[PDB]
Amino acid sequence: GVLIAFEGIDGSGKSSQATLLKDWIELKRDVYLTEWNSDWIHDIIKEAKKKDLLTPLTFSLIHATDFSDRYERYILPMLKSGFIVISDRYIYTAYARDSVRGVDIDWVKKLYSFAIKPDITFYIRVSPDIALERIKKSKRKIKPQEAGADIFPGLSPEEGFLKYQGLITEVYDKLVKDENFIVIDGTKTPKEIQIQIRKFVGELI
Amino acid sequence: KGVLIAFEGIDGSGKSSQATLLKDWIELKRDVYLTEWNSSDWIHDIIKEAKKKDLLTPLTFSLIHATDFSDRYERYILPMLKSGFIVISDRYIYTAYARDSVRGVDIDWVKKLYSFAIKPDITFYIRVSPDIALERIKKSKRKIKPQEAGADIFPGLSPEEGFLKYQGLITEVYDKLVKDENFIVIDGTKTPKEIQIQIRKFVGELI
Numbered sequence: 001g002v003l004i005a006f007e008g009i010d011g012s013g014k015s016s017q018a019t020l021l022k023d024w025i026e027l028k029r030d031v032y033l034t035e036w037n038s039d040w041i042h043d044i045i046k047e048a049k050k051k052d053l054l055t056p057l058t059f060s061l062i063h064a065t066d067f068s069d070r071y072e073r074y075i076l077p078m079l080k081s082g083f084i085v086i087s088d089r090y091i092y093t094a095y096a097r098d099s100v101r102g103v104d105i106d107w108v109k110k111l112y113s114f115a116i117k118p119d120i121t122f123y124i125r126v127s128p129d130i131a132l133e134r135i136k137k138s139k140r141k142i143k144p145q146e147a148g149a150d151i152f153p154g155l156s157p158e159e160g161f162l163k164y165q166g167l168i169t170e171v172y173d174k175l176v177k178d179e180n181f182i183v184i185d186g187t188k189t190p191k192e193i194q195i196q197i198r199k200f201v202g203e204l205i
Numbered sequence: 206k207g208v209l210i211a212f213e214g215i216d217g218s219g220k221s222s223q224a225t226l227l228k229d230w231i232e233l234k235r236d237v238y239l240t241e242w243n244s245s246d247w248i249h250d251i252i253k254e255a256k257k258k259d260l261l262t263p264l265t266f267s268l269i270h271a272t273d274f275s276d277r278y279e280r281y282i283l284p285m286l287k288s289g290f291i292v293i294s295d296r297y298i299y300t301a302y303a304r305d306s307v308r309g310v311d312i313d314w315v316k317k318l319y320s321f322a323i324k325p326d327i328t329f330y331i332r333v334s335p336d337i338a339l340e341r342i343k344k345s346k347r348k349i350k351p352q353e354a355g356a357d358i359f360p361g362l363s364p365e366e367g368f369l370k371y372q373g374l375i376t377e378v379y380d381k382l383v384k385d386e387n388f389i390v391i392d393g394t395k396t397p398k399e400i401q402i403q404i405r406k407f408v409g410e411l412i
């Protein structure tokens with residue numbers, strides 16, 4: 001059982017490369033792909049608390065709660081069954097998104113220590129500037145979570161994305177050495193990068 | 206200036222009875238606010254939808270209660286200790302230590318989880334046997350909640366038999382925390398008034 005994690009700023013190419021790589025493993029091996037889509041516990045609590053301003057701390061516990069249920073209901077059982085699990089975003093998303101709002105990152109690390117470290121974590125390194133260009137063409141609505149609208153209320157969605165995804169990057173780069181991140185340069189072509197992905201993974205043998 | 210006073214003990218040991226008697230005394234001299242460990246209704250909606258697809262692990266339940274506590278802690282508890290109040294917490298984080306470690310969650314990880322929370326200025330551990338506590342809820346005519354009986358970890362037992370063994374394991378965790386958490390051990394066998402006058406002696410000296 002091997003767990004491979006993708007992380008990087010939003011619009012950095014995470015899911016697009018995650019789905020092409022699940023199309024590759026699926027021909028040869030058991031593979032299961034997950035995104036942080038969050039799940040039902042985040043939905044209940046957010047709706048119940050739509051009126052109040054909750055603290056980053058409480059937001060942090062809500063996401064970890066919802067992740068803990070996916071982790072022990074799907075992720076961990078499939079790694080016990082031998083599957084490869086591809087996580088489109090893993091616990092290092094929570095490290096950044098909650099530590100950037102003043103939650104003690106070492107407390108977040110302890111919070112998530114119930115989770116196995118990925119066999120490999122692909123850090124797709126892309127500038128916020130270059131990555132913002134792609135969501136403009138995709139016709140997507142720019143979610144407030146993506147712009148850090150809670151932290152940057154005065155800015156426009158566009159302007160908030162640039163500043164928020166920047167501090168996200170600093171936390172990611174801070175994790176590179178301690179977390180054995182492998183940094184992939186997301187500047188490149190989807191396929192060009194994709195063949196870098198398939199080489200690194202294959203090494204497992 | 207703000208002071209936080211905690212009661213801990215198994216269910217039916219008298220915590221709420223002594224917390225409210227102590228609130229009747231403190232409010233004569235100072236601003237005091239009494240808080241309980243009551244869950245928000247979104248938890249009961251979590252358990253409802255859970256009972257429909259699959260069972261959540263003790264770990265997720267532990268994170269659910271810490272989430273529910275963190276919000277109450279930072280919306281009511283922490284501002285009022287910052288405002289100088291006395292806060293009486295009928296149950297506090299050591300209930301979470303006990304309830305989560307007896308279901309196999311690493312107690313040292315739970316300590317890290319709740320480490321955002323201030324440690325009580327005083328913690329009264331109201332110690333009574335499961336035998337004695339079960340005797341009183343039977344006199345109280347009240348129904349023994351499955352959570353009180355550990356129904357999730359001891360299904361099949363009767364409420365009485367489940368209460369007895371479950372609160373025994375809760376007692377073991379409380380007894381294990383006494384020294385490191387500087388518990389004030391109260392012999393809850395005694396009288397409500399005798400206990401309460403012992404309690405007001407301890408509190409007055411502190412404040």
Ligand SMILES: Nc1ncnc2c1ncn2[C@@H]1O[C@H](COP(=O)(O)OP(=O)(O)O)[C@@H](O)[C@H]1O
Pocket residue numbers: 009010011012013014015016017134135138186187188189190
């Ligand atoms: N390397 C790339 N170059 C150009 N466009 C891309 C690249 N990767 C993804 N896209 C496009 O940009 C958008 C970002 O998609 P996606 O990778 O799902 O973002 P996320 O990383 O948030 O999941 C998509 O509309 C996709 O079609």
Ligand SMILES: Nc1ncnc2c1ncn2[C@@H]1O[C@H](COP(=O)(O)OP(=O)(O)O)[C@@H](O)[C@H]1O
Pocket residue numbers: 214215216217218219220221222223341342345393394395396397398400
């Ligand atoms: N010191 C005491 N001695 C005898 N009975 C008590 C004492 N304190 C409380 N009781 C009774 O025993 C029960 C325990 O109630 P409570 O204070 O709600 O326990 P807890 O909050 O610890 O569950 C209540 O029915 C109460 O009437």
Ligand SMILES: [Mg+2]
Pocket residue numbers: 014015035088
């Ligand atoms: Mg995505």
Ligand SMILES: [Mg+2]
Pocket residue numbers: 220221295
């Ligand atoms: Mg009580």
